[PDB]
C-alpha cells in the first residue's frame, strides 16, 4: 500500500498543468527588485529587436541563390 493525506485535490491539479517544487524553496527576492526594466531598456531592446530580424531574411536571401542555382 502507501500514503498519505490530502491535498489530493490540490495535488491532482498541479498534475494537469505540470507545475513543480522546481525551486519553490529557494525564493529569495530578486523578482521583488530588478524584475522590471524601464520604458528605455524596453524601447532599446525593441530596437535590437529590429535590425536583427532584418538580416535573417538575407543570409537566407543570399543563401537563396547558391541553392536554387
Amino acid at each position: 500500500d502507501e500514503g498519505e493525506p490530502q491535498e489530493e485535490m490540490s495535488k491532482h491539479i498541479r498534475e494537469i498543468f505540470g507545475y513543480d517544487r522546481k525551486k519553490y524553496k529557494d525564493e529569495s527576492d530578486y523578482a521583488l527588485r530588478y524584475m522590471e526594466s524601464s520604458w528605455k531598456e524596453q524601447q532599446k531592446e525593441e530596437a535590437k529587436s529590429l535590425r536583427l530580424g532584418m538580416q535573417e531574411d538575407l543570409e537566407e536571401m543570399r543563401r537563396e541563390e547558391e541553392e536554387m542555382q
Binding site: 485535490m9 490540490s10 491539479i13 498543468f17 507545475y19 524596453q42
Partner: protein, 75 residues
C-alpha cells in the same frame, strides 16, 4: 501557495453575482482555484517567455502575450 489568498477571494464573489443572483461556494472548490490559476499562469509564462525569446528579447511585453494565446487558441 504563491498567490495572495485574500484578494484572490474578493474578485471571486464579484463575478458570481455578476451573472447569477444566488449561489455560493463549497470553498473546498475554491482551494483549487488559486492552485489552478497559479499554475495556469506559470503554464503561460514559459510560453509567453518563449515568444519573448523568439522575438529575440529578454524583457517580456504585452505583444508576446496576446500572441501566445491567440495561438493556444483562446482570446
Amino acid at each position: 501557495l504563491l498567490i495572495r489568498k485574500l484578494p484572490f477571494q474578493r474578485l471571486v464573489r464579484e463575478i458570481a453575482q455578476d451573472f447569477k443572483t444566488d449561489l455560493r461556494f463549497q470553498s473546498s472548490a475554491v482551494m483549487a482555484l488559486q492552485e489552478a490559476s497559479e499554475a495556469y499562469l506559470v503554464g503561460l509564462f514559459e510560453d509567453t517567455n518563449l515568444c519573448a525569446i523568439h522575438a529575440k528579447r529578454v524583457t517580456i511585453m504585452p505583444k508576446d502575450i496576446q500572441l501566445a494565446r491567440r495561438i493556444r487558441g483562446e482570446r
